[PDB]
Amino acid sequence: ARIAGVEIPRNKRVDVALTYIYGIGKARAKEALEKTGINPATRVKDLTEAEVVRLREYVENTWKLEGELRAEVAANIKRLMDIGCYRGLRHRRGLPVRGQRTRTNARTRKGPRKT
Amino acid sequence: ARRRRAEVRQLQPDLVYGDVLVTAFINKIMRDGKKNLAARIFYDACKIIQEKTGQEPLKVFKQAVENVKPRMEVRSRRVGGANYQVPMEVSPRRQQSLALRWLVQAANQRPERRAAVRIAHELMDAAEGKGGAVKKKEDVERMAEANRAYAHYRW
Amino acid sequence: KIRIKLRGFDHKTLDASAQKIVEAARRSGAQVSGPIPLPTRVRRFTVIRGPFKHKDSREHFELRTHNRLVDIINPNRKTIEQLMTLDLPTGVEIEIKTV
Amino acid sequence: EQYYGTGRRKEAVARVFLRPGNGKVTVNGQDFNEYFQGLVRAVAALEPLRAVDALGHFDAYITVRGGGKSGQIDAIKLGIARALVQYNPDYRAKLKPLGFLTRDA
Amino acid sequence: ARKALIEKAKRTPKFKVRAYTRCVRCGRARSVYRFFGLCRICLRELAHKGQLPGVRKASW
Amino acid sequence: PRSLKKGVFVDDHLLEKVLELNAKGEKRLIKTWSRRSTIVPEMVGHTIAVYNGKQHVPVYITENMVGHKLGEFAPTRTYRGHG
Amino acid sequence: GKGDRRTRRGKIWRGTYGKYRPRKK
RNA sequence: CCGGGCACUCUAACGGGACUGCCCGCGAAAGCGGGAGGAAGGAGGGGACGACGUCUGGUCAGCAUGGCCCUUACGGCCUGGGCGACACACGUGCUACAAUGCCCACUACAAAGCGAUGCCACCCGGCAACGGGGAGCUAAUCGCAAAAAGGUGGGCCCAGUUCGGAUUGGGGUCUGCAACCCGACCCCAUGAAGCCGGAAUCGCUAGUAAUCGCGGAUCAGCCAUGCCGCGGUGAAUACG
């Protein structure tokens, strides 16, 4: 339900609904769901409130989530810049850093076709 | 092919009906090399045509493939630098093979979710004579009768 | 007791010389283990036909290291005297080891 | 008393020993309907006996190496033909039109 | 740089990962085989004269 | 990279030179050919000169660098555009 | 997939053993 | 597992055997139909092989070879880079986007290759790459070595959805004294994008279209999804 405040997952099958949060996936979701022991088979509309609050207090206080992870990646790219590194330089050009080839395919972050 | 008549090929018979008219039907729905999916989706259809109506899946399949195979078909012939389309009696070797080819394309256009209910309903639609494949056959048979006047450019 | 191994390439004269060693051991009387043939080890090399810029059109060579094994369980005194001076190497390496 | 047959197709060598009995069949020490669980062409190897109507007149010991599933069963029926031409070789004039002793290349 | 390269290639020290394999008669910098230590052309030349033992033009 | 079972920046030449420098002072220029390692944890304000294959370029050290190597600051590429 | 490490296809492609792909049939 | 037989499987050798002979048809003949017989046919499937000539299309930068040429050099030297660059057009490799799909549990399947300057049994400790030992093997015996696709059993279900998953963050393993622009690893955390691909394009007619592991060579290290083998598995298709 209303787990991480503003970000709200609900609507038919809580197990895949928690995957829909930035920071929680299928592996960590199966981790939290196996720890809380709730069977994933039921939906979110048939659930007890205490299980939702314990889900909240578990995933909200155990790992790094939405606010801190987004701010952390922001500080990460700010750390890549202002040091004169190839990674920060490459992020400043707005081009991929994982050794791809720009003679033919880097359009995802290069943007539209600029003929 | 130039001189040899492209030698005929008989398939191995079916394992549940012992016939061969169902073998090529399994083989065309066999996509990218999956006979385990092909024969199972064909046998699923044979199971569906038990509850949709109380008929045998062999006798309903014969009716599904008898109407869809055409009698005539037009071909473009060059007689003196001009292409005239003439209709002719389509060979029985091509009749069933083009018939099942029409059946699979008629079933893949159906808006149903599963392919089993897509192929099963279109089979009885072909047996009744209202399916898309017999519709495609009806386009050709009316095109041939429209080109009926080509009765002196035959071969 | 004694393992006699023949290491060669050509199974033709290799099998022939091995069969003749078996025949000479049968000439010596007592039984001897049959010629159990070990499998051949293949060392393949893919080279190019042209001497430049041709990624396709490869040719492939091979190295066939054939091995034959005979084991003597009846070391008769002149059998071992005969098998040390009657060694005729036809390009085959011989290994006579005791255990 | 004992009839041996060999069947080879698609790298699956079938070594078949059929003995006179009730019709029981065993594959590599284990049995037919459990080693051929949920498949659809298990009767394809039994077809050469159905053709001569030898339903329950032959027991068989089966040892096959190599391949997958279908090369094994086709090699089985090839061995049944190779051995049913051994015992009572009159089955050639009724075997050749249906096509059993045919190693598919 | 065709004699100096094969002369400096024999100097396996100064961080052996900076060292590379080479042909010994021809001198090609790439595709030299670790089983023979010769270039592909050197193999094509020698093994066809029967000068290379154990090899055979495979045909199967 | 280099794991945590082993330590980062294991170089004995320039480190002995700069530890001899940090005790006396005056912070002059230091030439270096080995850009194979890190310089960021305990050196700030020092002027070095790293070779890019053609000319020894000068590099001053800052504080905003946590674990960056030496050679990524001085590239060897001379692009200057293509058109 | 074949570039990802938190799946099985990429584990087969990289030929490595790990948590998501252990040795147990 | 052992005596033991070792017929056999096996691993070589090396022969035999299938070749439009047979007969009927057809055609002057050639050739073209039928069966017989086989493990294999009417060349079994292929491998090698590539007539005289060809563009003198390629290279003295594989090496020679006419010449020209620099020698305190175009030689060597050692250092660092770079050759790995990007705003980019092209092909050529690879997976997928799910429900005949995704994980998860044992069981079972080859076949090719290396290695006592190495392959490395096996443990211990670690989740681990690894280390502390180290057995056996110059090696069908010791070893690399798990074959895998699979099956069944369960978890799920067309939901960016256990599918798929960039990248960022930091730590453990080892090769090179030394790994940053430029090696491979073990791990977390996030997961980009792809739910299905224009004009066009070409491949290929029975073991191929697909499809799965396993080795070997250039390796110190790996860039390799590069290559070559090696086996598992095998549909239609060819009327015109």
Ligand SMILES: [Zn+2]
């Ligand atoms: Zn060479």
